[PDB]
């Protein structure tokens, strides 16, 4: 005795995908895939996983149309065939959800690393620049004292450079040395952006986003008669 | 006995203009091309329709309803067919099943639009927030630099500006503005405007425009008739 | 009795399409569809219209047999159209007439499509001008606030080309007060892109359907004259 249960599935909705898509935009920004590309990626991952299970069937519902897909199972009873089809759909859904959990955490790790490497480099540079400028201020103070330049001798600010700092006068130069510790670090234009981007990536968690690789057009049927 | 046929294809750019405008407003450059939306909409209609051939067959008295491409190896247009008992009945039931699907798809589209609006808003609010944090951190750095320069201006005992010509001031040349102007910059720290990229203003306005979107305003069509359900002049075979 | 006339049609060639592709590039710029995508769009619209005729010609008092099929086993294009006539001259004549009839309906559909695309391209360029206008206003609004802040610093000492938020006060309170009157009446400053968008909108207004010689198909094989009846 043979009973066939049928279901029609298609790509998941933007609502079902919103969390993964948001996570992808937080990690990749403009380089993140379009919502429609993610939908196609997921139903493809689901279809390929179903096809490699390896009696069930997976075929396009309309000839020459990629979507939707008709899934079928031949059981011993109408209730069993329906049950087993829904179970196999859930089983595939979970395998795809697991391979999505891995890929996202790998992308988060790649994201975190590149951003921490970028911040570290910019921090080292900003400190080395502060350190050099301090040595330059220390050197300029010796020149200002020799030359008896106590008050600033600046007419145009452009005149003041890393090599003409003594023009600021020994009084202000001493103050700059005395107050070195509280002199702020100056970072490359994107530092703060990079640091905020990293904070937002750390806020991501797969458990928050309940992602689905498919959507039901028609749930598994209860066959009225046998084949 | 009697077959009623209809031919349906993707909606026209005119029929889709509203949904495409809503999509453009939500995603900007990331929005799908007009031709991709047309395929998505006929895709959503045909997918919903494909449940009916299966459901109508799994009845006590099975009904025959078909959805196939009109020309072999061509995705569009699609031929929808219904086998009825009478000519008037076959036509009536085909049009009813097309209307039934049309209603379900309109509801799916209403939910889709609000889901996309929610996603678009999240992305734009995340963008504005980030940009605001950056602009504040940049302002905060400048105030710290002014605070440091005020200590130098006081030690050098320079109260009035010391400079005639000045393009820009640096950490080392700020004290030349004098302790009087530097104190004023600190006392008014709060009212110093934040400086944002031109993208910021685009993003903020784009968020305002998303809030203006309403489903009832957009007359959306998921298909276009090539041929409405026929009235068969004679029975089959 | 029965005579079969056959024709093979396919997508329009790159020369037949040059004008429609030139109009689409005026409307969408770089966002305009690839020439091969336009070809498929035009043949798609022709074959869709044609696909009604087999059904409608059969559902007549006196049924007529017209068929559309792909000419090549696993190819979308070209398409083979067949008509069964009563006479040899008639089958061929009626096939060519039905191809012309579809060609006329599709030309009307294309005229409506061009105006729908012109409306969409208009909307996108007018939306672009409006955001550039919002940005230019927000920039003007920020500049007035920066000068207002600098005026507070100037009032704490000063009275009398490239300036910053920190060096504006050096222009003196007198000059700064004047700017709050001047810059507030000073017209908006837009990117050269703004005037270019206005130019692209002017070029869309110059588009006319009668100017572009539009073809939705191309003959591979014109309707045949059958040698002997069915
Ligand atoms: Cl002084
Ligand atoms: Mg910013």
Residue numbers in the entry:
A (entry chain C): 4 to 57, 68 to 240
B (entry chain B): 5 to 241
C (entry chain A): 4 to 163, 171 to 240
What is the paper's account of this structure, in its own sentences?
Site-directed and in-frame insertion mutagenesis studies of WzzBSF revealed that mutations in the TM or periplasmic regions can influence the Oag modal chain-lengths. Some WzzBSF mutants display shortened or lengthened Oag modal chain-length distribution, while other mutants display no change in Oag modal chain-length distribution or completely inactivate WzzBSF. The residue 107 is located in a helix in the base-domain of the protein, close to the trans-membrane regions. A107P confers a shortened Oag chain-length to bacteria and leads to a loss of resistance to colicin E2. Binding analyses reveal positive cooperativity for the interaction of very-short (VS) core-plus-Oag polysaccharide (COPS) with the periplasmic domain of WzzBSF, and a decreased COPS-binding affinity for the A107P mutant. The crystal structure of the mutant protein shows only subtle structural differences near the mutation, compared to the wild-type protein. Our observations suggest that a single amino-acid substitution on the inner surface of the periplasmic domain can lead to significant effects on the regulation on Oag modal chain-length, and implicates the LPS-binding affinity as an important parameter in the mechanism of this process.
The Oag polymer chains are neither all of the same length nor of random length, and fall in a defined range termed the modal distribution. This distribution is regulated by two Wzz proteins in S. flexneri: WzzBSF, which confers an average modal chain-length of 10–17 Oag repeat units (short (S)-type), and WzzpHS2, which confers a very long (VL-type) modal chain-length of > 90 Oag repeat units. The S. flexneri Wzz proteins are members of the PCP1a family and are located in the inner membrane. They contain a hydrophilic periplasmic polypeptide segment, and two trans-membrane (TM) regions at the N- and C-terminal ends.
